[PDB]
Each structure stands twice: as structure tokens, then as C-alpha cells.
Amino acid sequence: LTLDGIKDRVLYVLKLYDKIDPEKLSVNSHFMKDLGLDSLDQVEIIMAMEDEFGFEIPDIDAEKLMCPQEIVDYIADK
Amino acid sequence: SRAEYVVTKLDDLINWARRSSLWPMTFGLACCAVEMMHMAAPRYDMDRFGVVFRASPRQADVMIVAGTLTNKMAPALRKVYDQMPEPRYVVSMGSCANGGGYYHYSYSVVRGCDRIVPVDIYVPGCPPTAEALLYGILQLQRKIKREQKLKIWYRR
Amino acid sequence: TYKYVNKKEQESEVDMKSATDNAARILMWTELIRGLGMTLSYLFREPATINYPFEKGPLSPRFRGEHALRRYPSGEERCIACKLCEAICPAQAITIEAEPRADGSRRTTRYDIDMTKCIYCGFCQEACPVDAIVEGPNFEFSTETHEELLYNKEKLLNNGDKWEAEIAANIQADYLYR
Amino acid sequence: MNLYTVIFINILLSLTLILVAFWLPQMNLYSEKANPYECGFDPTSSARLPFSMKFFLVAITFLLFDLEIALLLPLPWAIQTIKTSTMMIMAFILVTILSLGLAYEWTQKGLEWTE
Amino acid sequence: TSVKPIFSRDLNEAKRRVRELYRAWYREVPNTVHLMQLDITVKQGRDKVREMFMKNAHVTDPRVVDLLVIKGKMELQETIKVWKQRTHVMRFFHETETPRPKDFLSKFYMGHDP
Ligand SMILES: CCCCCCCCCCCCO[C@@H]1O[C@H](CO)[C@@H](O[C@H]2O[C@H](CO)[C@@H](O)[C@H](O)[C@H]2O)[C@H](O)[C@H]1O
Ligand SMILES: C/C=C(/C)[C@H](O)[C@H](C)/C=C(C)/C=C/C/C(C)=C/Cc1[nH]c(OC)c(OC)c(=O)c1C
Ligand code: SF4
Ligand code: SF4
Ligand code: SF4
Numbered sequence A: 001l002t003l004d005g006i007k008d009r010v011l012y013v014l015k016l017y018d019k020i021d022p023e024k025l026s027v028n029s030h031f032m033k034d035l036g037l038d039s040l041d042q043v044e045i046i047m048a049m050e051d052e053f054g055f056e057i058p059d060i061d062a063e064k065l066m067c068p069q070e071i072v073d074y075i076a077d078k
Numbered sequence B: 001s002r003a004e005y006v007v008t009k010l011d012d013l014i015n016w017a018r019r020s021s022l023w024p025m026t027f028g029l030a031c032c033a034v035e036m037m038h039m040a041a042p043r044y045d046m047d048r049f050g051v052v053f054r055a056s057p058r059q060a061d062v063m064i065v066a067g068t069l070t071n072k073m074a075p076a077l078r079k080v081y082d083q084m085p086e087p088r089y090v091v092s093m094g095s096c097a098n099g100g101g102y103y104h105y106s107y108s109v110v111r112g113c114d115r116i117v118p119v120d121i122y123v124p125g126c127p128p129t130a131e132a133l134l135y136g137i138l139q140l141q142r143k144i145k146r147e148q149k150l151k152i153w154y155r156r
Numbered sequence C: 001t002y003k004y005v006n007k008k009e010q011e012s013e014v015d016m017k018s019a020t021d022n023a024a025r026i027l028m029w030t031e032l033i034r035g036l037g038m039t040l041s042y043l044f045r046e047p048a049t050i051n052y053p054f055e056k057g058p059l060s061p062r063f064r065g066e067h068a069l070r071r072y073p074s075g076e077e078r079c080i081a082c083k084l085c086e087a088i089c090p091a092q093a094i095t096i097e098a099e100p101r102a103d104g105s106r107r108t109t110r111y112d113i114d115m116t117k118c119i120y121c122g123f124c125q126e127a128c129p130v131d132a133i134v135e136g137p138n139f140e141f142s143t144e145t146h147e148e149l150l151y152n153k154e155k156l157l158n159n160g161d162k163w164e165a166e167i168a169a170n171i172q173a174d175y176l177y178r
Numbered sequence D: 001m002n003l004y005t006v007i008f009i010n011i012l013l014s015l016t017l018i019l020v021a022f023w024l025p026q027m028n029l030y031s032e033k034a035n036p037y038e039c040g041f042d043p044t045s046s047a048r049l050p051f052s053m054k055f056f057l058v059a060i061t062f063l064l065f066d067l068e069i070a071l072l073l074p075l076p077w078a079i080q081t082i083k084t085s086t087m088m089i090m091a092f093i094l095v096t097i098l099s100l101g102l103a104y105e106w107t108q109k110g111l112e113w114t115e
Numbered sequence E: 001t002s003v004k005p006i007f008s009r010d011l012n013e014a015k016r017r018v019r020e021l022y023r024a025w026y027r028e029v030p031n032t033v034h035l036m037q038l039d040i041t042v043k044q045g046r047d048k049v050r051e052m053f054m055k056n057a058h059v060t061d062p063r064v065v066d067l068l069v070i071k072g073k074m075e076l077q078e079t080i081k082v083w084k085q086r087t088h089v090m091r092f093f094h095e096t097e098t099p100r101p102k103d104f105l106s107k108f109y110m111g112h113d114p
Helices: A005-016 A031-035 A039-053 A068-076 B002-020 B032-040 B074-082 B095-099 B130-145 B149-154 C016-027 C030-043 C084-088 C123-127 C153-172 D002-023 D056-072 D084-107 E011-035 E042-054 E062-080 E086-093 E104-110
Strands: B062-066 B089-093 B121-123 C067-069 C094-100 C106-114 C133-135
Touching: A005 A039, A005 A068, A031 A039, A039 A068, A039 E011, A039 E042, B002 B130, B002 B149, B032 B062, B032 B130, B062 B074, B089 B095, B089 B130, B121 B130, C016 C030, C067 C153, C084 C094, C084 C123, C106 C153, C123 C133, D056 D084, E011 E042, E011 E062, E042 E086
Parallel strands: B062 B089, B089 B121
Antiparallel strands: C067 C133, C094 C106
């Protein structure tokens, strides 16, 4: 379901978002471990995807999108 | 000088018009507002001094704080006061408005309306009798009579 | 026992005599003319207004107005710093300090009434065992600043000397009811 | 020409009082003074939002009756005709269908405001 | 140590309601700032939201987190419906209050308080 138009965007916003360091960011970097974000930083990120792809993500779902890939995977699973 | 004299009598002229038309804002808070209604009642008939209640703060000259000012109502009192065109005067009426009164130590009461707006005349009492408020209102006209705006402009 | 204010359905029959009365009531606005009459009658009544400040509203000798500190006929202060007016004041409006005087008397060095806390209840007048603190008959003492309504001892003694002639006669007219 | 003069004179007075009102007083402008009024609290929304009209049907029925005034206003000239029978018959019918139109709307709850 | 739950049966089921409240508060800052004509930026408003959620970062009793969530929803509602005013929203930002120094010496110079 278009799996690299997604990759360009799901990582586009993560570049704009602050507390993520763009250079260290990798399409398979764990949000909590590698980058070192907080549970409330992830909530901010997931909402960012809502800005683009424009479709709500239930909290149950969003509490697993721990690195940029699953996002990409999740939306492809739209 | 002649001009300084003319400015003095022009000062009396504009004061007189403001003394003779004080339009208080229809606005009372608690039991002190009941005695403010009695001053409007026939016996005292504040209307005979040129005192007319107007609902809108734009059309009002005077804000009489007639009752307790709580913290919840404090921002709203300031807002209607800001919207009063200038010149504008505040009469603080009653212990509650004067300094908190019976509720001075309450967690929810502003300890005096003069923390929120500038006050011209303080009227003591809980409540002040309608005459006491009337004396205070007429003491505000004498304060306006002593106004010297035009003369001070001349000496600038 | 109870009564009906707005019950009347003991229905009668509309006679031609009565129907024409209902119509004249509706077409000729008769009850609205009756109301115009009542306000016309008031126009020719004497107004209830009094000519303030040249005329004053009636008051009784009990009237609770401005405070004052009284003296004895010899000029000695009545207040003995018992602090009962302070213990009763519903508003905590009275502050008092005392010490032995130079002649050994029990007298106050401080006596304040924050007239913006006072609710003018007159309770201090009741609590005083020697009629030292009273509420005089003055009610026309509005100021132009908050600070002028914080009365210290000098101010209250001055009100006592100012108003004594009238305070003494009001107590004389009312102490037998107390 | 007179009727033009008297109305400019009226306009100039209304203008002249408008200028004095704005340039004579001493003005002190700040944001909290010039906000809109709403009984002491901030407005919760602009006043330009739609405002439902519960009497809209009567509003457009005013238009239809308004033009039926335009047809009755020539009557003062019309009662000067020789054909009095015609003038009167046309007048009676015109007023009667305005009345019949009004009765129909009244009975159809058309004069009632929508809840 | 057994007690009736309010809503959540343990801290994990309660954090679900916390993040859902943080979402709602996060979506509403740009409106509060726009409708109340606040003189702040959205980023500055949203930071303040995060600061208040971290003020209660040590709570662990699930019943307590239920009543903080209950209160926070009430606070959110007071803001969305514009029952609060500029003054009320701006009170979170303590803009007129000088903050008391947290070092011993400065406290020692300033008065008797600890
Ligand atoms: C569908 C809607 C219908 C509802 C409305 C119906 C209205 C009908 C009105 C009928 C009334 C006409 O009334 C009629 O008036 C005319 C003139 O005015 C009279 O006519 C009389 O006067 C005219 C002049 O005025 C003379 O020139 C004429 O010779 C003489 O007959 C008739 O004798 C009378 O019958
Ligand atoms: C219309 C114009 C006039 C001149 C009128 O004659 C009078 C003078 C104005 C009136 C009646 C009110 C003036 C101010 C005000 C808003 C009072 C508060 C109030 N108002 C009450 O009722 C009306 C109460 O009822 C129990 C109250 O408790 C309270 C606290
Ligand atoms: S001062 Fe007394 S009368 Fe006036 S509002 Fe307060 S309690 Fe009521
Ligand atoms: S009148 Fe009442 S409130 Fe006032 S000083 Fe006396 S006891 Fe206190
Ligand atoms: S005024 Fe009366 S009650 Fe108060 S301290 Fe003096 S003697 Fe006692």
C-alpha cells in the first residue's frame, strides 16, 4: 500500500520534531532506548503522524510504535 | 492672566456638566446593592441630582461597588471598569467593598475592591444607609468640582 | 386552611349581555385604561421625596453609626482595656493593647477599629461593661482614601468629644431598654 | 433646490457633531477598554456566526404583502375614475385575496415562529 | 492493603487514561491561544502543559491517578468552553511572581524561612 512515500514522510516529521537528533535518527532506532525519549514524547510524535495521514490512531495501537518502522508498517497496514 | 482666568471658568463649566450628570452603572453585588436601590427609591430620588442608572459600561460614568467582591467576580469587575469611558469614577460602598468587611479573612474574597480598581470615594457601613451613600455620591460631585484639568494643561 | 388564587372555572354561560362586555374589554382596551388611570392619580399625589441634605431621614436613638470612645463626667476615659469588645467583635475589627498608666490605672495604649472590617453590628456596645465604646449617630463620614477609615485611639477619642453632647442623650433615651 | 439645501444642512449638523465628539474628548486607548462587551466576561465566540431566524417565513411573507401595498397606494387617484364600478370591484377583490392569503398562512401555522 | 478501585485496576491501566488526557490537552493549546487571544506561542503553551503533567510524576497509587485524571478533565473542560478567562489560563504561567531562590545562602540573606 505505497511503502516508501510513507517512509519519506514518517521520517520527515521526526526530523522536524525537536528532541530527536536528526543525525542519530535511523529508520529502526528505538524511541525509548536509542534516542532516549519519554512516554509523553512519543504521544507527541504519534499525533504528528495524525497531522499528515489524517486518520486517528487508537491509544492501544500507538503504545507500540516505538521506532519509526512500526509507524511505517502501521500506516501501510491502513 | 486673562487666558488663565478664562481657563479657570472653562474648567468650572466642564466640571459642572460632569457633576450634574453622573450615570452609575447598573451593577450591584450583595446586600449593599439593596440600599443602593433605596437611594433610587422615591424618598431620596437620586434622579433629582441628575443621577441615572445606565446598564452598559459604555454609557456609564460611575461604578459603585455595592457588595462583596469575590475572587471569581474580580476579573469581571475589572473588565466592565476598563470598558467604562473616561472620565470614570468608582465609589466603594460598604465594608465588603471597602476592605473585605465581614469576609476579610475568607479564602474566596478580595480584601477590598481597591486592589482591583482605583477608588475615588469610600462609603463606610454594613450597609451604609441610603443617605450615607447619598452623602458619598454628593461628596464625589465636590471632588469633581475641585478638578483642574484645563488649568493644569495651561501650565504645561 | 388554603385558598385558590387562580381558580374560577365554575363556568357560567356567555350571555349576549356578557359577550358584548368581553368584546368591549378586548376592543376598547378597558383594563389598560384602568392602569393609565392609576398612574394618573399618582401624578397628582405629593411626592415622597425629602430635600437632602437640607432634610434628613428619621432615625432612632438606637441607630448604629460611627464609633466613639467616651469619658466620665470628670474627663477620665471610661475604657479600662478589659478587651471584651475585642473578644466579641464578629469581624475582628478591634485591636487593643494596654499597660499600667503612669498613675497605675488600667488603660489602653492602643485602640483601633478598622472601619472596613466592621459590620456595625453594635456587639461591642453591648459587651462593654462601662459604656466606653459606643456607636454614635453619625453616618456621614465617607472619606477619599482607604487609610482614613482605620481609626486609632486618638481619632476615636476625638469622635467621643465631638459627639458626646448627642451620644449622652441617646443613651439617656435608651439605656432603660438595655 | 430647497429640499436639497435643507438636507445637506441636516447632514452637515450630523457630521459636525460627529467630528466634535471624536476630536474634543481626551482619549486613552488600550486593548482591554476596546474589547467587545459581554456582561463582564470574555466572549466565547465572534458575533458574526449564524443567528437563526425563527420568523423567516413571516419575513418573506412581508415582502409579498409589501408589494400588495404598492398596488393599493394608487387608490386615491383611482377613485377619480368614471368607471367607479370597475375600480371598486378590482379593489374589493385585491384586498380580499390578500385576506384569503393571510387566512391560509394563519391556519397553516405560518405566522407561528419555528421552535 | 486491599481497596476499592475508582476506575483503573492498576497503574498501567491508569496511564492509558493519562496519555489520553495529555492528547486532549495537547490538541487544545492552539485553540485556547487563538480564542483567548493569549500573548504566548503554542510551543510555550504546550511546554506548560507538559510541565504540569510532570509535576505529578511521582504518583503511583492508581486511585490517586484516577482523581488527577478526573480533575484534569474538569480543567480541560473549563478551558474548551471558555469558562476560564485570560487571567485564569495565564495563572499557570506565574508571570508576576518572583521565584524564591532554592539555595541556602540566598534564603539565609532573605529571611528566617527554610
Ligand atoms: C374573489 C374575491 C371576491 C370578493 C369580493 C367581491 C366584491 C364584489 C363587490 C360588488 C359590489 C359592486 O357594487 C356595485 O357598485 C356599483 C358602482 O360602485 C353600483 O353601480 C351603480 O353605480 C355606478 C357608479 O357608481 C353607476 O354608474 C351604475 O349605473 C349603478 O349601477 C352597483 O349598483 C353595485 O352593485
Ligand atoms: C432600572 C433602573 C433603576 C434606576 C432602578 O430603579 C433601580 C435603581 C435598579 C435596580 C433594580 C438594580 C440596580 C443595580 C443592580 C444590578 C442590583 C443588584 C441586585 N438586584 C436585584 O434585583 C433587581 C436583587 O434582587 C434580590 C439583588 O439581590 C441584587 C444584588
Ligand atoms: S458590607 Fe454588609 S451590607 Fe454591604 S455587602 Fe457586605 S455584608 Fe452586605
Ligand atoms: S459594631 Fe460589631 S463589627 Fe463593628 S467594631 Fe463593634 S463588634 Fe466589631
Ligand atoms: S471599650 Fe469597653 S469592652 Fe472594649 S476594652 Fe474598653 S472597657 Fe473593655
